């Protein structure tokens, strides 16, 4: 299945925080605040003018690791954006951003995307009342994503939810703290996510 | 003779029949003369049984013999309703 | 090792004899009629033609002859006979 | 509809039969150019009233023999022996195409 393994090494290679952990990420304990050069024996040697293939490859790998997705699933979502009408880079981000495990993390039920994945997978999340443990679920406009209340009094969710008391959610979402519930309003515009990714490079990757 | 019967479509453990007028001698999923309605026996959707009442009586009037399950579904659509 | 396909075989044999016997008479009486017509002899020709017409149409109640098989037999027989008579004429009793 | 074609009698030689050479035009499926194709039909002439050079119409019909299933419909033009001459030359050119 999904990757599982050291993730700092991942953010180090891509040369930017991928925020793959939530709490330590915004700390000075992060290897990126700490040692921001790619892993292994050669991270500290001088770079070499990247080939243009590598620049697109590293840009695609960047966007994908952010969301913790397989290349199989990343490739299918990109194919749908392409075959779909409308600007492919944006519909791609939308299609990625419409993911269940992602909307859970983005809402605040979980501190990191890997945790939201486990939150969805362990039964702790409901789409419109019904329990939905599939992490790749396509959340749709006007869907109510909530915490299954037979685990509403759960020490992780309470903590992380209280941490949202105050914090804002994206302009495309809503969140009833202590309702423990949220709405997907519309699918996000490209401007809404401030992603460290030139997604058109991803398009150029897959058109080789 | 000619028949009004169910042709199974759908997938495994997901039967979706078309109610269908065809020659008796074809295999049940083969070429049929006309599709006069459908039928989802698990009622997974609001309208799990459509029948074009006019055509059903036309083939009825012309000699096409409904089975039994098709007769019940046609009846349940008031096709025989005098 | 069995069937009721043996039955169908046995029954088929019975019917084979029945069809054979009927089609034989039909061929024998038609010929006799056409031979009488060729000599004319028209009184006996039309009589045999009528017993041939009879048999032909009795063969086509069942399986020995198709309707259109009897009609073609009857057509050609009534044309051989009549035309042979017409070459010296006089059609006596029943038939035309 | 029974098919109706127009062509020229190219052969008389047969009792109650005329060979009607029939031509058609169409764009090549791949190269688009307009090309001509042609096909000889043996046509039923129950009164041997049709003869060499007769541009005629033939109509699809119940089979009359082997390979004979058009009847001549009506005459359309007479004495077009140029059409016939084209055919025959083509045939005679075949004498030189051997080994």
């Amino acid at each position: 299945g999904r990757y599982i393994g050291p993730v700092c090494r991942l953010c180090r290679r891509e040369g930017v925080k991928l925020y793959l952990k939530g709490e330590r990420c915004y700390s000075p304990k992060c290897a990126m605040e700490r040692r921001p050069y790619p892993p292994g024996q050669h991270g500290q040697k001088r770079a070499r003018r990247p080939s243009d293939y590598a620049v697109r490859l590293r840009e695609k790998q960047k966007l994908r690791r952010i969301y913790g997705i397989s290349e199989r699933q990343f490739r299918n979502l990109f194919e749908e954006a392409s075959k779909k009408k409308g600007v492919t880079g944006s519909v791609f981000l939308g299609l990625l951003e419409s993911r269940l495990d992602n909307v859970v993390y983005r809402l605040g039920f979980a501190v990191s995307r890997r945790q939201a994945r486990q939150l969805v997978r362990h039964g702790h999340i409901t789409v419109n009342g019904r329990r939905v443990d599939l992490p790749s679920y396509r959340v749709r406009p006007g869907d109510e994503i909530a915490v299954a209340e037979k685990s509403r009094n759960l020490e992780l969710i309470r903590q992380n939810l209280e941490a949202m008391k105050g914090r804002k959610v994206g302009p495309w979402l809503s969140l009833d703290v202590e309702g423990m519930k949220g709405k997907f309003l519309r699918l996000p515009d490209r401007e809404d996510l401030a992603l460290p990714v030139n997604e058109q490079l991803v398009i150029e990757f897959y058109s080789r | 003779m000619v028949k009004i019967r169910l042709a199974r479509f759908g997938s495994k453990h997901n039967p979706h029949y078309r109610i269908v007028v065809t020659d008796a001698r074809r295999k049940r999923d083969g070429k049929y003369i006309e599709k006069i309605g459908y039928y989802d026996p698990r009622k997974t959707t609001p309208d799990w049984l459509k029948v074009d009442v006019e055509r059903a009586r036309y083939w009825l009037s012309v000699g096409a013999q409904p089975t039994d399950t098709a007769r019940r579904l046609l009846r349940q659509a008031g096709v025989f309703r005098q | 090792r069995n069937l009721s396909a043996l039955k169908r075989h046995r029954q088929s044999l019975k019917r084979r004899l029945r069809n054979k016997a009927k089609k034989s008479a039909i061929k024998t009486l038609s010929k006799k009629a056409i031979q009488l017509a060729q000599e004319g002899k028209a009184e006996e020709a039309l009589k045999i033609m009528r017993k041939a017409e009879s048999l032909i149409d009795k063969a086509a109640k069942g399986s020995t002859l198709h309707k259109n098989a009897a009609a073609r037999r009857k057509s050609r027989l009534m044309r051989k006979v009549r035309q042979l008579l017409e070459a010296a004429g006089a059609p006596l009793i029943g038939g035309g | 509809p029974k098919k109706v074609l127009t062509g020229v009698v190219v052969s008389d030689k047969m009792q109650k039969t005329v060979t009607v050479l029939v031509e058609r035009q169409f764009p090549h499926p791949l190269y688009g150019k307009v090309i001509k194709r042609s096909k000889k039909y043996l046509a039923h002439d129950p009164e041997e009233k049709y003869k060499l050079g007769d541009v005629v119409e033939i109509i699809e019909s119940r089979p009359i023999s082997k390979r004979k299933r058009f009847r001549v419909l009506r005459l359309v033009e007479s004495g077009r022996m140029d059409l016939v001459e084209k055919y025959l030359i083509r045939r005679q050119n075949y004498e030189s195409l051997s080994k």
Binding site: - | - | - | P27, Y31, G32, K33, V34
Partner: protein, 137 residues
């Protein structure tokens, strides 16, 4: 002369490229219909019917852009491109749904239709197709 129309297109092409004021093409009423469109769209100034040693010709009046700056001051052409589509070797016919769009509408296609000689845009407007004569841009 195997293709008069082609010959006019090449008579105009060869003359514009040397910046002739005019060029004569032997007369035919079909060519006038084509010239008429080139006039009506401003690819040529116009034409008149002349006598050249007692024979009928069509004097085409050619048009250029302004004299240019720099090395090589030769003006831009108005007729950049004029080329035969349909030809005696391969006639080319299109239905109304297959009328091409020459240079995203910055060019034209001229066609012969049983409703007259038209451009791509009148063809589509009168709902007819026909023989694709040339493209010009």
């Amino acid at each position: 002369l195997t293709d008069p129309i082609a010959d006019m297109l090449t008579r105009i092409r060869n003359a514009t490229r040397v910046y002739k004021e005019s060029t004569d093409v032997p007369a035919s009423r079909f060519k006038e219909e084509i010239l008429r469109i080139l006039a009506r769209e401003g690819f040529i100034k116009g034409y008149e019917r002349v006598d050249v040693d007692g024979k009928p010709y069509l004097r085409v009046y050619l048009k250029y852009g302004p004299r240019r700056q720099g090395p090589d001051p030769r003006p831009e052409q108005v007729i950049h491109h004029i080329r035969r589509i349909s030809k005696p070797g391969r006639r080319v016919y299109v239905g109304v749904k297959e009328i091409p769009r020459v240079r995203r509408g910055l060019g034209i296609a001229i066609l012969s239709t049983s409703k007259g000689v038209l451009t791509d845009r009148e063809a589509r407007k009168l709902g007819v197709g026909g023989e694709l004569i040339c493209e010009v841009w």
